Design a protein around this ligand. Structure first.
Ligand SMILES: *[C@@H]1O[C@H](CO)[C@@H](O[C@@H]2O[C@H](CO)[C@@H](O[C@@H]3O[C@H](CO[C@H]4O[C@H](CO)[C@@H](O)[C@H](O)[C@@H]4O[C@@H]4O[C@H](CO)[C@@H](O)[C@H](O)[C@H]4NC(C)=O)[C@@H](O)[C@H](O[C@H]4O[C@H](CO)[C@@H](O)[C@H](O)[C@@H]4O[C@@H]4O[C@H](CO)[C@@H](O)[C@H](O)[C@H]4NC(C)=O)[C@@H]3O)[C@H](O)[C@H]2NC(C)=O)[C@H](O)[C@H]1NC(C)=O
Ligand SMILES: *[C@@H]1O[C@H](CO)[C@@H](O[C@@H]2O[C@H](CO)[C@@H](O[C@@H]3O[C@H](CO[C@H]4O[C@H](CO)[C@@H](O)[C@H](O)[C@@H]4O[C@@H]4O[C@H](CO)[C@@H](O)[C@H](O)[C@H]4NC(C)=O)[C@@H](O)[C@H](O[C@H]4O[C@H](CO)[C@@H](O)[C@H](O)[C@@H]4O[C@@H]4O[C@H](CO)[C@@H](O)[C@H](O)[C@H]4NC(C)=O)[C@@H]3O)[C@H](O)[C@H]2NC(C)=O)[C@H](O)[C@H]1NC(C)=O
Lengths: 208, 208
């Protein structure tokens, strides 16, 4: 009894023409005696044929794992085109069909807010700078940090939370040596999200 | 083939003598033909006998569900005592054993920081006030908000995130009408966590 899992591309993959968005079709618990698999892909029901089917991998539990990767057009996904994977195995009476697309909902533009460390935080040798992203829909988003055009390393972001009003929000937290902050260095969280003009925005933060 | 799941109490249950901490032993996919179950509980291997075993509930998939609830002593769990559930069913060749205890690790005191809304946020009719809890271990924690001793309603908190240094942190976000904030009302996130003196602390925030 095999099952299939269908993964969407990653947000910023989608948002940057530069990047390569992929839809991933994963089939597990494939019969170890009859490992032969057939993938079929569809774009709004339209069969396409450009998917790279990876070599089957033997797992440690007497099953195989089978991955099919479809390259997608940025705009296509953005315009909410459907991607359906069909998987046909001889040890299964009917082929499995999963489908995925950009989540159905009105797009909503993220509001970004930079926030100092707390007065009391100025006790410790590390401070936390606070990026705040809210109101956005869907959930698919990415934040980064940087200073002097160079990306910062020591930050962490939450996974998006559902807000009362059906929007999502999240916080990003960049920690830095107090000295940097007090020297008046400028830092900015950058946010990628389909609702943004050019899918990107930057909001800066430095000690007043 | 039944399975068991063993749930810990909830943080603040543990932290307030007032509250009632419970350890929950859940057994699912119990045979619909042979539904007869036997629970056994243990405190550091020591069998106790004070658990309330709930009536078995027929599920919609031809299985039963069986819950056993053990009341625990606040200090006991706090001192990291072990709670092992044994489940014995006739349709299973060996009884299932799960065990749980306060997570193993050095306790670490949460640092709480209140943070204004962003200057730019003062555009909208709703603002966000920002409670920040960091450095804590373990993860089991709870935040609330209040003003004028009355609990606030419209806030949301993230689930704890793992921080670089093996600590957890999280943010709480309380939204309020701009007018309240500009009137100079005082708001404070309150945090319950075992590392706190008296398991509690409060940090306030009002417009300067
Ligand atoms: C033999 O050993 C095998 C290898 O270990 C093992 O295979 C594994 O099988 C499980 C199923 O039991 C399967 O689990 C699914 O995982 C989905 C996410 O997979 C992630 O994360 C894991 C680890 O965290 C990674 O190892 C995977 O590679 C994968 O990572 C992603 O991979 C893709 C491409 O490779 C990347 O693009 C991603 O970036 C990357 N992510 C990360 C974080 O790195 C998970 O979503 C599945 O959840 C759904 O099914 C569960 C039941 O299995 C339900 O509990 C749950 O509710 C989900 O249901 C769905 O919910 C959706 C809404 O959220 C709906 O849309 C769906 O309709 C609904 N239901 C479905 C589809 O049923 C799931 O947990 C693993 O993927 C798989 N391992 C690998 C490596 O492929 C075998 O089980 C072993 N067999 C036996 C018999 O023991
Ligand atoms: C027939 O229909 C039945 C009823 O719907 C159904 O029963 C369900 O079976 C599934 C297993 O498939 C079982 O899922 C487990 O759920 C655990 C959490 O349960 C929560 O959340 C659900 C919904 O979100 C609630 O409905 C539950 O009541 C329960 O809520 C909690 O309940 C307790 C007491 O009631 C409260 O105190 C809590 O406050 C409350 N929570 C909330 C949010 O309200 C989940 O933790 C389990 O995860 C582990 O097993 C998975 C495999 O099933 C793994 O993918 C996963 O990795 C986990 O593995 C563990 O990881 C741990 C570390 O994190 C380790 O410690 C463990 O060692 C390791 N492994 C284990 C134990 O295997 C799990 O998903 C449901 O609980 C159960 N439903 C109910 C209502 O009890 C049947 O499946 C149906 N049968 C069939 C054949 O279809």
């Amino acid at each position: 009894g095999p099952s299939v899992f269908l993964f969407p591309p990653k947000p910023k993959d989608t948002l940057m023409i530069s990047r390569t968005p992929e839809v991933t079709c994963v089939v597990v618990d494939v019969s170890h005696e009859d490992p032969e698999v057939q993938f079929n892909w569809y774009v709004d029901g339209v069969e396409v044929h450009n998917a790279k089917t990876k070599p089957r991998e033997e797992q440690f539990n007497s099953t195989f794992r089978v991955v099919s990767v479809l390259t997608v057009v940025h705009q296509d996904w953005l315009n909410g085109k459907e991607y359906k994977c069909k998987v046909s195995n001889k040890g299964l009476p009917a082929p499995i069909e999963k489908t995925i697309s950009k989540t159905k909902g009105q797009p909503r533009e993220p509001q970004v807010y930079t926030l100092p460390p707390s007065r009391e935080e100025m006790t410790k040798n590390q401070v936390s700078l606070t990026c705040l992203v809210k109101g956005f829909y869907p959930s698919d988003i990415a934040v980064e940090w940087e200073s002097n055009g160079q990306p910062e390393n020591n930050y962490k972001t939450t996974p998006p939370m559902l807000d009362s009003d059906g929007s999502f929000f999240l916080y990003s937290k960049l920690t830095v040596d107090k000295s940097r902050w007090q020297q008046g260095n400028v830092f900015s969280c950058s946010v990628m999200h389909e609702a943004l003009h050019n899918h990107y925005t930057q909001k800066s933060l430095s000690l007043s």
